[PDB]
């Protein structure tokens, strides 16, 4: 749950802060967090949605890191970041929908979807950052 929230929060920050012309100092920490997320998720396969009419979606992560060399963000940087952010946002939305439609009498607090169960592993704990909501 905390890893899923951290993914969503990083993506929201990327959408709000990775904009053309912005100083890199405004995103530098965000870029570090985003690259950490990319490294953590790269090489992992996920599957979401096999209940009701929710479609079976397969997710593969093979993305390059964002640059750290610019003084102000330009169009190329924003386009690359936007493509990666779009894929990640779709993945996060699908995982959230998969988890929202499931329930358990015994351990309902625990994750129910396989994607969130995988995200609860230690290898994804690095993705965790600010939990302010």
């Amino acid at each position: 749950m905390d890893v899923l929230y951290s993914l969503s929060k990083t993506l929201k920050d990327a959408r709000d802060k990775i904009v053309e012309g912005t100083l890199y100092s405004n995103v530098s920490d965000l870029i570090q967090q985003f690259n950490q997320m990319i490294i953590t998720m790269n090489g992992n396969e996920f599957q979401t949605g096999g209940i009701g009419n929710l479609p079976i979606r397969n997710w593969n992560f093979d993305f390059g890191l964002l640059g750290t060399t610019l003084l102000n963000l330009d169009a190329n940087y924003v386009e690359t970041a936007r493509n990666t952010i779009d894929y990640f946002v779709d993945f996060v939305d699908n995982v959230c929908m998969d988890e929202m439609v499931r329930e358990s009498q015994r351990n309902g607090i625990a994750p129910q979807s396989d994607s969130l169960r995988k995200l609860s592993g230690i290898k994804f704990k690095r993705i965790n950052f600010d939990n302010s909501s």
């Binding site: 530098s28 750290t68 060399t69 003084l71």
Partner: protein, 799 residues
Amino acid sequence: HQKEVQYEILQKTIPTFEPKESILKKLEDIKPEQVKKQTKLFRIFEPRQLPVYRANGEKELRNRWYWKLKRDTLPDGDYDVREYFLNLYDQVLTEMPDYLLLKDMAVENKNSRDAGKVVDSETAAICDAIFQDEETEGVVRRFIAEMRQRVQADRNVVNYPSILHPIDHAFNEYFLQHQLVEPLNNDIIFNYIPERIRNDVNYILNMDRNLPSTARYIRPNLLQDRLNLHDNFESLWDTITTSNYILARSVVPDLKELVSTEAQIQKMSQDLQLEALTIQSETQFLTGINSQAANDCFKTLIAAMLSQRTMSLDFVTTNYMSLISGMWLLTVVPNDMFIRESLVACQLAIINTIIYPAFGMQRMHYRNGDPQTPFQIAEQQIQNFQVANWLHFVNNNQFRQVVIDGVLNQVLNDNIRNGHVVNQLMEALMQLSRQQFPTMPVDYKRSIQRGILLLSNRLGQLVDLTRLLAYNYETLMACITMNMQHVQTLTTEKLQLTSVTSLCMLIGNATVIPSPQTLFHYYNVNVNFHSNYNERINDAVAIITAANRLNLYQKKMKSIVEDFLKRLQIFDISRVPDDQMYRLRDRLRLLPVEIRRLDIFNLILMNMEQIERASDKIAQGVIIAYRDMQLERDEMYGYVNIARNLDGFQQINLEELMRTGDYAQITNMLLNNQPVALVGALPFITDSSVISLVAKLDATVFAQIVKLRKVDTLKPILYKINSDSNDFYLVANYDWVPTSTTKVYKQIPQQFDFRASMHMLTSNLTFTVYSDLLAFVSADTVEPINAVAFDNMRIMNEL
């Protein structure tokens, strides 16, 4: 010959200095980060008196103070200017002080009426010049006469008046506000000692020194590896492990009171009865069994485990004594410390020469690349409990990973630390001494069993040796500051099993533990290497980031990475593979810049434009407007064809024009007399001739651009017409408006303002900075006879 050629091919890709031992010196010459002290305030500007002119162009009777670069050495061309500013960034970083004590720079204020002082002597010169100036305000004069420093010795504070340009004040204030010195006390030094050595009862640590409240020190930057050189840098990691191995060898203690080599050799010869056998190698059997070999084995084992450098096993299969000793070696040393091929070969030799023949089992047909080692198969295929249990331990005795004080450490099984598992080994091989060896010839069987008993009957000595080795490893590992990453290295340390036999058969009961001074020296060397590693990473990252943010696209990060590796002191850069160099460049690019260097770079970046426009030898551009424009009236020139901005003109970037080589647009505009503004750092000619203005020579300096397709020789004319001109009468004695078709985009110097330049610089009155913290620790050790292990029992109990 062929083997040498192939090994040379492999070694040419490893940046390890060929005389391995020499590396030790290069490791021990790394000193702590040199402590830099500021001797004078950092300045880029100075006040200077310049003549001024009235609106009519006549020189006034008074000069005015303006801020001018102390060293005006800016080059032409925007890219060259940015390179100059990168060089300025490097200069500031190198000369950046680690602490400041303003009282050292304080000087007597001549005009003070209350024994005033100022920092620095340049401030005194400026203050005297302003005091003697007739145009100075009376209030400013009285303030100079009255402004005072404040020295609070009880608080250890000093405040001094200073005259500084705002950029100079920014730099000096950053230096004062961000000093690297921390308060030093006995608690800090005590916690500086490794935590496991402070808990070791074999070492008595005392603090027989008193540290004043004015004691200072600079914390080493013991940040763990940000480059992850253990991952995907085979050659660099090979070099790092080799250097660590050499250092560990240097610090491993020497064995004392070993068993007499003559007596043990005679005993082994009498038991083995080699002469009575038909072995083709009768003399070679006991060769290499001596005290020097035992010491070499001890050092090699502990150093390899400390440095996590892979080991290879070199043995002669016919020498079953070497295999019997290798059984102990595999019992005590984790199996992952050896290259897989060597471990497989040694285990298969032991299986097919001793163990399986002992139990009448068919010799193992082991297949290379099998996920199971020969001992793992033998454990399942052997039914005897003693041998099977020993095999199980040897199979599962890999290093365990644990983080102590933030450092990853490779730690041994507790049964190795207390030496108890040797008993199991003894058990196992005692069984091997009772076995029939069904089809083996009886004399060879007797020799093998008597060698097995030679190792067996030294149970107490081997338990003592295992405990001693484990204790030494733990004590020296307490002094490691970088993560002990276990990686199979490209090259290995070759370990002779004859040296293992020497260590097993010659070890006595003389406990030898690292000296407290040896531990402190090892820890200091490790800390120095780690701190230098982190500091050079920071320097490389800062320079790379500055070059990228300064848009220095022709800069080669390869040179930066080479300088970084050279400053690491342990790499022969000529043997670094290119792919690893580029991977290092990428990983360095991905890191964030350290706070101090980044703040300095931000200061330089934000002050770049002001510093550049203060230069007297480059202009910011030239507007070619083929209409007649009146020469502006400026206090610094008289009449001058100066442009305050480029508004209203198409801008052509001269750097882009130079880089592309496409002069079509510029040529078309110059041919068709199209108004334009050429933008870029440009040298200019200062022309004081009115006749030159009438001749319109400023409009004749652009055809060479079309002719040569170059912009490096463009030198626009800047008219400076005032009463000092030899032909100023033409301006004065005729009714006309001096005009020109070109203007020079340049700025006017900033006037000196006393209110905006007078600051109070604050620092401490005095403190002493210390480097060797461990020199404040009186470290003694118990008698080696009384040295105990982690379990509170003596390391060697056979006495």
